[PDB]
């Protein structure tokens, strides 16, 4: 995007001042859309010495004589050329700038326009800057952030010591990663993405995307009327144990609710009977185990079962002991079908096995599972999209790193999911998603497409729950998936 | 406004390119507001070699990659610097320009953006330009005009041989006189006035205004609860004759419907009885005349009647013969009260009398009456605001020159009224307005304020008629005035 601005100026020949004017007017129009008529509000515009601040001067200037009051507090020690030109215009148009910030200044204003730092933020915020930001955050005023709330690192979404909490963030060209990942996503408040005049070809050149409704709608497979169950694929799910009897059910129904033709579970007896007592449209094959867990003794029967399906999901509720590890790894090494690898199958996975497989894979870890898979801490892997990209590329797989924002990548393309709510922070949610992914692969979508469509619909189904989200359970999520699908169209 | 652009560039220091960018984006946003989503439309943008065309290139460029198709036909022989910069940007962004216009080109487009000439139009349009404009006008496509429809003189509203007929005109800063006066007002279609970044102080520096709802609302006099009829003034109307018995009635009710406390008519007997048979709240004084018309024999009685009122309206239906002329002129020469002078009182008026009067006057001619008053042709006075200004200034009066757009001026300030419809093109309409003006003067408004408020409310009342406007009559207009007043608040 820094490249995108540079290229639009230096190669397309758009004057930097024109981009800055377009930026500032976007902010004004966005504020109108969100606040109604602006003429009765008093505005405090906080400007840094960079181009974020220059954008702020354009805002301040365009409000002069139209709103009740405008004041700029200029907080920098020097001005870039664009900021300087705009500062000059603001003053020439009669605008008041002060350079001293006063704790009680927030008193006489209704809206704070935060133009202190955008993408040029480098390093922790301290000193006056920190104080001012902490004052704004205690004030209860309406806060509108220019580009990115000041103090959010726009590449990571991390808070650099402190950051503005915005009601509205107006960003230019494309969303920044720091609007998408938390905590930045939380501080952004409502996000509007403004077109400021970059050529559309450059804007579409970005390789990381937010999964949208329109993208998911164009990926949903077709339902030709002259069809039969095999048209819509066959999934095998290897799952469950005597400790964990519920997981297979949630995964199997997850495949069926997204439109899969046939779903077969392989589950240790008698825990297999649990699935059809709840959902008799599932096939739940009893697997004879020594102690209630899959082991090498079950390898041959599972590979046999695999021959007559399109995709295999493995992992939810398998448990994690040595015999499960031996079985999961030998199985995956031999299985020549796409695999969806989750939960305890990830906990025992030997990643060499992924490298040697000819057929594809999707892995669906939460950060604790990712952390153990790559031998790092939760904090190093959480929201770490570059690590996820390297992992997917090195191991030839699609990685779905689950969290309130989910990252989906094959190492070349990375997509970010923002649907969902905290009702999904509850046992059983993951199991459902695993079924959904396998189901969509069986219907003909690529592992990456299948993952994209499933994370979005899974979170969107959660949002459609009628009562308080904290009461949502996996069973109710399943009931909601077909409404999510209908609403997507 | 040319001064306004120059001053914003040369003294405030806004780069001309920034004004041009703001102009072009206004047009795009206005088109969205009016057409909805633009992404399915095909646009033909016609650009002249001036800054109007430069605005057009900004439009074309901002549509690239967002709509179905964009084509510019460049029709000039050379380009101003701003147009050239924008033309260069449009091409650099991948835009197609052709310089040959082809009669069938309109075929493959849905919207024509007319950026051929704006305020720089000089002289009749001929040649290719004329052909292209005539083609656009026969095409049935959606036409959006940049600044002013090409071929309208923006200072007068006249068509310079031919002009574009627009569905939507997007103008910058302030309405131009050529959007306000006909025929230009008709060719403008729907007008949006866009703020492109001129300092608000310069925009408010324009001396000619369009009468708005908000202006009229702020001028309506107060109705203090502890009031009595004298609080709201007293009007005398000298009007009527044996030929013209209806006019006094319409004028008198016009004063009462705008809230005047007392209204007295002086009308030749027995034609005076006509007024109270219809509206018994009117006082209609019988004047004894020799032959059914006012003459010098009635001077003394009229001046007596004048002593106990605040304002006098004179003229509607008096007739026009020598004795009326002698009476009207001697009366006005002696009357030391504000006068509202209409109809036959204008037809007989000696304008020297206006110069010698100490008290104020409003004159309310239609163009035929103005033409005879200044000894010019109808065509020379019609919509001739500069002539109206000179007349008002020379004779110390307010001039209300009635037409579909009405001009109201005291020689310093000129206001244009755009309310009304063709139902007012019917006998009796003028008589009503005369009463309204006198009424508002009696309530405490200046002659100019009274005229401003009355022309607006008179036309607005017409618009509120429930059935087809051609069936509107003066009597029904009167019934509508109090609803117009309520809707203004």
């Amino acid at each position: 995007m820094k490249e995108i601005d540079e290229l639009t100026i230096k190669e397309y020949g758009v004057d930097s001042r024109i981009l800055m004017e377009r930026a500032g007017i976007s902010v004004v129009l966005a504020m109108e859309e969100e606040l109604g008529n602006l003429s009765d509000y008093r505005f405090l515009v906080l400007c840094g010495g960079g181009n974020n601040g220059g954008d702020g001067f354009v805002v301040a200037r365009n409000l002069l004589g139209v709103v009740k009051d405008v004041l700029v507090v200029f907080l920098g020690k020097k001005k870039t050329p664009d900021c300087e030109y705009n500062y000059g215009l603001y003053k020439k148009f009669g605008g008041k700038v002060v350079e001293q910030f006063e704790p009680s200044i927030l008193n006489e204003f209704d809206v704070v326009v935060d133009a202190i730092f955008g993408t040029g933020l480098r390093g922790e915020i301290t000193g006056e800057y920190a104080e001012i930001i902490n004052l704004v955050n205690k004030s209860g005023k309406v806060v509108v952030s220019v580009d990115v709330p000041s103090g959010i690192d726009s590449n990571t979404g991390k808070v650099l010591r402190t950051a503005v909490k915005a009601d509205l963030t107006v960003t230019f060209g494309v969303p920044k990663i720091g609007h998408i990942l938390f905590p930045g996503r939380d501080l952004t408040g409502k996000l509007k993405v403004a077109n400021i005049g970059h050529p559309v070809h450059l804007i579409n050149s970005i390789n990381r995307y937010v999964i949208t409704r329109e993208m998911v709608r164009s990926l949903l497979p077709e339902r030709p009327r002259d069809s039969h169950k095999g048209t819509y694929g066959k999934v095998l799910i290897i799952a469950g144990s005597r400790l964990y009897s519920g997981a297979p059910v949630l995964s199997g129904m997850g495949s069926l609710k997204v439109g899969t033709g046939l779903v077969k579970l392989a589950v240790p007896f008698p825990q297999n009977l649990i699935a059809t007592s709840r959902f008799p449209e599932l096939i739940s094959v009893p697997i004879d185990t020594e102690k209630g867990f899959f082991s090498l003794q079950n390898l041959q029967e599972c590979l046999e079962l695999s021959k007559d399906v399109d995709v295999v999901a493995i992992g939810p509720g398998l448990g994690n002991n040595e015999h499960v590890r031996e079985f999961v790894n030998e199985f995956l090494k031999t299985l020549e079908k796409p695999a969806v690898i989750d939960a305890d199958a990830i906990n025992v996975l030997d990643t060499s096995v992924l490298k040697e497989r000819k057929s594809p894979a999707v892995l669906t870890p939460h950060p604790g599972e990712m952390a153990r898979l790559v031998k790092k801490t939760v904090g190093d892997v959480k929201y770490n999209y570059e690590l996820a990209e390297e992992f997917a590329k090195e191991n030839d797989c699609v990685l779905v790193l689950k969290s309130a924002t989910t990252i989906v990548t094959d190492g070349e393309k990375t997509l970010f999911n923002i649907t969902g709510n905290t009702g999904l922070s509850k046992g059983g949610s993951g199991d459902v998603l695993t079924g959904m992914i396998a189901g969509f692969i069986a219907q003909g979508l690529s592992p990456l497409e299948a993952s994209t469509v499933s994370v979005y619909l899974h979170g969107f189904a959660a949002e459609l729950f009628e009562q308080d989200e904290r009461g949502l359970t996996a069973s109710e999520l399943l009931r909601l998936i077909p409404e999510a699908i209908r609403r997507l169209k | 406004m040319k001064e306004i652009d120059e001053l914003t560039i040369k003294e405030y220091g806004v780069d001309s390119r920034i004004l041009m960018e703001r102009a072009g984006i206004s047009v795009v946003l206005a088109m969205e507001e009016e057409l909805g989503n633009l992404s399915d439309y095909r646009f033909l943008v016609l650009c002249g070699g001036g800054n109007n065309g430069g605005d057009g290139f900004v439009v074309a460029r901002n549509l690239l990659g967002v709509v179905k198709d964009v084509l510019v036909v460049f029709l000039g022989k050379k380009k101003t610097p701003d147009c050239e910069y924008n033309y260069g940007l449009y091409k650099k962004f991948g835009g197609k320009v052709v310089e040959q216009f082809e009669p069938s080109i309109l075929n493959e487009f849905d919207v024509v953006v007319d950026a051929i000439f704006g305020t720089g139009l000089r002289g009749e349009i001929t040649g290719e330009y004329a052909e292209i404009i005539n083609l656009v006008n026969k095409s049935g496509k959606v036409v959006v005009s940049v600044d002013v429809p090409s071929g309208i003189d923006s200072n007068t509203g006249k068509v310079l041989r031919t002009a574009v007929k627009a569905d939507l005109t997007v103008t910058f800063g302030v309405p131009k006189i050529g959007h306000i006066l006909f025929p230009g007002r008709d060719l403008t279609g729907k007008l949006k006035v866009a703020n492109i970044g001129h300092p608000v102080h310069l925009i408010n520096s324009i001396n000619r205004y369009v009468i708005t709802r908000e202006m009229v609302r702020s001028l309506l006099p107060e109705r203090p609860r502890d009031s009595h009829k004298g609080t709201y003034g007293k009007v005398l109307i000298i009007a009527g004759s044996r030929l013209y018995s209806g006019a006094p009635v319409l004028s008198g009710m016009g004063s009462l419907k705008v809230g005047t406390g007392l209204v007295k008519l002086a009308v030749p007997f027995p034609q005076n009885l006509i007024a109270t048979s219809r509206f018994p709240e009117l006082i209609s004084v019988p004047i004894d005349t020799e032959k059914g018309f006012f003459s010098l024999q009635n001077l003394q009685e009229c001046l007596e009647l004048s002593k106990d009122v605040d304002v006098v309206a004179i003229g509607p239906g008096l007739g026009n013969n020598e004795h009326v002329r002698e009476f009207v002129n001697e009366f006005l020469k002696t009357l030391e009260k504000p006068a509202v002078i209409d109809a036959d009182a204008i037809n007989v008026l000696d304008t020297s009398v206006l110069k010698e009067r100490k008290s104020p006057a409003v004159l309310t001619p239609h163009p035929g009456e103005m033409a005879r008053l200044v000894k010019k042709t109808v065509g020379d006075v019609k919509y001739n605001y500069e002539l109206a200004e000179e007349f008002a200034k020379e004779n110390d009066c307010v001039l209300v020159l009635k037409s579909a757009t009405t001009i109201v001026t005291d020689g310093e300030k000129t206001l244009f009224n755009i309310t009304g419809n063709t139902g007012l093109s019917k006998g009796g309409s003028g008589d009503v307005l005369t009463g309204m003006i006198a009424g508002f003067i009696a309530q405490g408004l200046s002659p100019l304020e009274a005229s401003t408020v009355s022309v607006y409310l008179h036309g607005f009342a017409a618009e509120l008629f429930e059935q087809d406007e051609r069936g509107l009559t003066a009597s029904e207009l009167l019934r509508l005035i109090p609803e117009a007043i309520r809707r203004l608040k």
Binding site: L29, E32, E33, N37 | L29, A30, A194
Partner: peptide, 7 residues
């Protein structure tokens, strides 16, 4: 809202 457009 009439920052941009007056009717």
């Amino acid at each position: 809202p009439a920052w941009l457009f007056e009717a």
